[PDB]
């Protein structure tokens, strides 16, 4: 039976500036939760509570590696240093949990710190985010005086005698406070009560708010994303972290208080699957971490969504397509590692040596098909050549490349030894090749980004392609008449047979298709393939021996070369779908920005005191695109940016892409 309830489950992450004390708050979360007063996921316990903590990434920009965190933790505790409120990185992080709704508390770390002041760093809350947050608590003293903190939901006082944690006295409210903390325990009611409309009513009617009622009403509307409380401390000297860790169970949620994860079937990705926490339903977890220990190897850590699993038994792998044996289960706690049977709804642990499950893959059934993380579009939009500096170096890189396909699904490399990688964009592609330089000692020289073009054609044209050779031994010959005509942007090649009466033979009619493919591929006019263009066979020629499905392969190449110079081919390049939230104030130079890289805006919406932007901009546009919007925007904004559709160059630069690759 499982140790602990889904009700008494927290999966948390810890979100804060390096400055803000990121590391000292975490290693003190592990020693309150551990048993004894980096893992990519800890398994700890808190009162009575199942408490999970993530590690979360160093990413001052949004990338497929922070999404999949938000998606894996339910809750978070916001770190802020107490002399300078949120700062941009904090924000454009606040920002993101907020789209993947992820209730938050807040910490005002380093009360004890030169310069520490608790109201100005919630008022920083409200100006830079609009946030609905206030104070649970009240600190008495700050700096060198910090020495209290006034519980304003119970109305006690906690004063501290050391640095160490221990030895804590509970105190009366001091006399000279009691009006303050009376004061701010209205001003939490209130900004829950904007929430509640019951609450409001009680409020405004005077009656009196039990704790129990008052505790109730912050859970609701903290799980609901609709309010942060606000606590305060110093994590270094041991003030305030028991009192935060009873906020993570007392208002930070569930797996069952947040929205469900959204995947799709295999066998139709149009079909909805919700997958919600019950140990009743299909089994259903997303794998997110990829570690190689020394001793036992490899390490896959994986969150259960629904469902349950035991060790010794078979799963697919729904994104791979191949079943796998799930041989033994690891959980890691702060001081051991511990072996078990069975994971549940809500859980988190380590597969150990997975054949071929890696970072982004679903687990599912092996009768069941839920895929949990996918791309709409899959392919490389921008591509890079990297040559190794020596055999060692080839040797290293070819390890590098193995290694890092099991970390990031959204690269693609192939490898004479020079290889070409293709990425999501410019960052992409930077994270991976300094990963491979500096941490597998690749020596390398690396090529300038090149953007994923392709070509199409324009007009229509009636063309034969006609082989004839006896080289050399015996003939081959291939006739075919093929009209060529361009397609609806998006809807790719159509090949259709119109021979009548046998003059082109069944058997090499696909051969004629398959010639057309590959001919394709190569492209016409500046080597990028063709696309969206329809081909119909409908006349030629043939010899019951010299004929061959190789002859009529060449024969439809013939073809397409003729056709390309009747047919008005042209450079067609990715657009790609930028969508921007930035504090409102910054319009001006956000859309200056996006009409200077060729692009443009369709419907722009409020949200908070922020837009969300929905541009169109050109991925050749797209180079320093981070850098111009931190500096645009005093570093507070965010952005993604995905595949979209193919659009024609412009025609000098067409002209100017064609002059360059004919060097
Ligand atoms: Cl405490
Ligand atoms: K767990």
């Given at each position: 039976?499982?140790?602990?309830?889904?009700?008494?489950?927290?999966?948390?992450?810890?979100?804060?500036?390096?400055?803000?004390?990121?590391?000292?708050?975490?290693?003190?979360?592990?020693?309150?939760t551990?048993?004894?007063?980096?893992?990519?996921?800890?398994?700890?316990?808190?009162?009575?509570?199942?408490?999970?903590?993530?590690?979360?990434?160093?990413?001052?920009?949004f990338?497929?590696?922070?999404?999949?965190?938000?998606?894996?933790?339910?809750?978070?505790?916001?770190?802020?240093?107490?002399?300078?409120?949120?700062?941009?990185?904090?924000?454009?992080?606040?920002?993101?949990?907020?789209?993947?709704?992820?209730?938050?508390?807040?910490?005002?770390?380093?009360m004890?710190?030169?310069?520490?002041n608790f109201?100005?760093?919630?008022?920083?809350?409200?100006?830079?985010?609009?946030?609905?947050?206030?104070?649970?608590?009240?600190?008495?003293?700050?700096?060198?005086?910090?020495?209290?903190?006034?519980?304003?939901?119970?109305?006690?006082?906690?004063?501290?005698?050391?640095?160490?944690?221990?030895?804590?006295?509970?105190?009366?409210?001091?006399?000279?406070?009691?009006?303050?903390?009376?004061?701010?325990?209205?001003?939490?009611?209130?900004?829950?009560?904007?929430?509640?409309?019951?609450?409001?009513?009680?409020?405004?009617?005077?009656?009196?708010?039990?704790?129990?009622?008052?505790?109730?009403?912050?859970?609701?509307?903290?799980?609901?994303?609709?309010?942060?409380?606000?606590?305060?401390?110093?994590?270094?000297?041991?003030?305030?972290?028991?009192?935060?860790?009873?906020?993570?169970?007392?208002?930070?949620?569930?797996?069952?208080?947040?929205?469900?994860?959204?995947?799709?079937?295999?066998?139709?990705?149009?079909?909805?699957?919700?997958?919600?926490?019950?140990?009743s339903?299909?089994?259903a977890?997303?794998?997110?971490?990829?570690?190689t220990?020394?001793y036992?190897?490899?390490?896959?850590?994986?969150?259960?969504?629904?469902?349950?699993?035991?060790?010794?038994?078979?799963?697919?792998?729904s994104?791979?397509?191949?079943?796998?044996?799930?041989?033994?289960?690891?959980?890691?706690?702060?001081?051991?590692?511990?072996?078990?049977d069975?994971?549940?709804?809500?859980?988190?642990?380590?597969?150990?040596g997975?054949?071929d499950?890696?970072?982004?893959?679903?687990?599912?059934?092996?009768?069941?098909?839920?895929?949990?993380?996918?791309?709409?579009?899959?392919?490389?939009?921008?591509?890079?050549?990297?040559?190794?500096?020596?055999?060692?170096?080839?040797?290293?890189?070819?390890?590098?490349?193995?290694?890092?396909?099991?970390?990031?699904?959204?690269?693609?490399?192939?490898?004479?030894?020079?290889?070409?990688?293709?990425?999501?964009?410019?960052?992409?592609?930077?994270?991976?090749?300094?990963?491979?330089?500096?941490?597998?000692?690749?020596?390398?020289?690396?090529?300038?980004?090149?953007?994923?073009?392709?070509?199409?054609?324009?007009?229509?044209?009636?063309?034969?392609?006609?082989?004839?050779?006896?080289?050399?031994?015996?003939?081959?010959?291939?006739?075919?008449?093929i009209?060529?005509?361009?397609?609806?942007?998006?809807?790719?090649?159509?090949?259709?047979?119109?021979?009548?009466?046998?003059?082109?033979?069944?058997?090499?009619?696909?051969?004629?298709?398959?010639?057309?493919?590959?001919?394709?591929?190569?492209?016409?006019?500046?080597?990028?393939?063709?696309?969206?263009?329809?081909?119909?066979?409908?006349?030629?020629?043939?010899?019951?021996?010299?004929?061959?499905?190789?002859?009529?392969?060449?024969?439809?190449?013939?073809?397409?070369?003729?056709?390309?110079?009747?047919?008005?081919?042209?450079?067609?390049?990715?657009?790609?779908?930028?969508?921007?939230?930035?504090?409102?104030?910054?319009?001006?130079?956000?859309?200056?920005?996006?009409?200077?890289?060729?692009?443009?805006?369709?419907?722009?919406?409020?949200?908070?005191?922020?837009?969300?932007?929905?541009?169109?901009?050109?991925?050749?546009e797209?180079?320093?695109?981070?850098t111009?919007?931190?500096?645009?925007?005093?570093?507070?904004?965010?952005?993604?940016?995905?595949?979209?559709?193919?659009?024609?160059?412009?025609?000098?630069?067409?002209?100017?892409?064609?002059?360059?690759?004919?060097?």
């Amino acid at each position: 039976a499982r140790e602990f309830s889904l009700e008494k489950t927290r999966n948390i992450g810890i979100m804060a500036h390096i400055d803000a004390g990121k590391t000292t708050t975490t290693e003190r979360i592990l020693y309150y939760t551990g048993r004894i007063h980096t893992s990519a996921a800890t398994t700890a316990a808190w009162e009575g509570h199942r408490v999970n903590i993530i590690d979360t990434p160093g990413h001052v920009d949004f990338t497929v590696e922070v999404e999949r965190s938000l998606r894996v933790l339910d809750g978070a505790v916001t770190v802020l240093d107490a002399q300078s409120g949120v700062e941009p990185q904090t924000e454009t992080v606040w920002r993101q949990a907020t789209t993947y709704g992820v209730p938050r508390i807040v910490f005002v770390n380093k009360m004890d710190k030169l310069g520490a002041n608790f109201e100005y760093s919630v008022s920083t809350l409200h100006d830079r985010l609009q946030a609905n947050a206030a104070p649970i608590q009240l600190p008495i003293g700050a700096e060198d005086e910090f020495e209290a903190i006034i519980d304003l939901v119970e109305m006690k006082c906690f004063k501290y005698t050391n640095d160490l944690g221990t030895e804590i006295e509970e105190i009366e409210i001091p006399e000279d406070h009691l009006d303050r903390a009376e004061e701010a325990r209205a001003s939490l009611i209130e900004a829950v009560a904007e929430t509640s409309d019951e609450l409001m009513e009680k409020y405004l009617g005077d009656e009196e708010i039990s704790v129990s009622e008052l505790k109730e009403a912050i859970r609701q509307a903290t799980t609901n994303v609709e309010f942060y409380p606000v606590l305060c401390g110093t994590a270094f000297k041991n003030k305030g972290v028991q009192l935060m860790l009873d906020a993570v169970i007392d208002y930070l949620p569930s797996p069952l208080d947040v929205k469900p994860i959204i995947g799709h079937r295999a066998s139709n990705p149009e079909e909805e699957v919700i997958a919600k926490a019950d140990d009743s339903a299909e089994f259903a977890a997303l794998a997110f971490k990829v570690m190689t220990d020394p001793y036992v190897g490899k390490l896959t850590f994986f969150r259960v969504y629904s469902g349950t699993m035991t060790s010794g038994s078979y799963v697919k792998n729904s994104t791979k397509g191949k079943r796998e044996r799930v041989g033994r289960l690891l959980q890691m706690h702060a001081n051991s590692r511990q072996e078990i049977d069975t994971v549940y709804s809500g859980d988190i642990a380590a597969a150990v040596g997975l054949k071929d499950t890696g970072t982004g893959d679903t687990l599912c059934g092996e009768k069941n098909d839920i895929i949990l993380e996918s791309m709409e579009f899959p392919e490389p939009v921008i591509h890079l050549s990297v040559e190794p500096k020596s055999k060692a170096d080839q040797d290293k890189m070819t390890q590098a490349l193995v290694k890092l396909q099991e970390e990031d699904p959204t690269f693609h490399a192939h490898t004479t030894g020079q290889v070409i990688i293709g990425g999501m964009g410019e960052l992409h592609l930077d994270i991976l090749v300094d990963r491979m330089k500096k941490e597998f000692n690749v020596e390398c020289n690396v090529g300038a980004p090149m953007v994923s073009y392709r070509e199409t054609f324009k007009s229509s044209a009636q063309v034969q392609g006609k082989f004839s050779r006896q080289s050399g031994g015996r003939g081959q010959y291939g006739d075919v008449h093929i009209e060529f005509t361009p397609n609806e942007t998006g809807a790719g090649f159509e090949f259709e047979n119109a021979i009548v009466g046998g003059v082109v033979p069944r058997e090499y009619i696909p051969s004629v298709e398959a010639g057309l493919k590959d001919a394709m591929e190569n492209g016409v006019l500046a080597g990028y393939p063709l696309i969206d263009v329809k081909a119909k066979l409908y006349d030629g020629s043939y010899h019951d021996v010299d004929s061959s499905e190789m002859a009529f392969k060449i024969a439809a190449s013939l073809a397409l070369k003729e056709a390309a110079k009747k047919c008005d081919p042209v450079i067609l390049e990715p657009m790609m779908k930028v969508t921007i939230e930035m504090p409102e104030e910054y319009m001006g130079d956000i859309m200056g920005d996006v009409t200077s890289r060729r692009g443009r805006v369709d419907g722009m919406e409020p949200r908070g005191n922020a837009q969300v932007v929905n541009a169109y901009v050109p991925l050749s546009e797209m180079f320093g695109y981070a850098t111009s919007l931190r500096s645009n925007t005093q570093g507070r904004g965010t952005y993604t940016m995905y595949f979209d559709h193919y659009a024609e160059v412009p025609k000098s630069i067409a002209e100017d892409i064609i002059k360059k690759n004919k060097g």
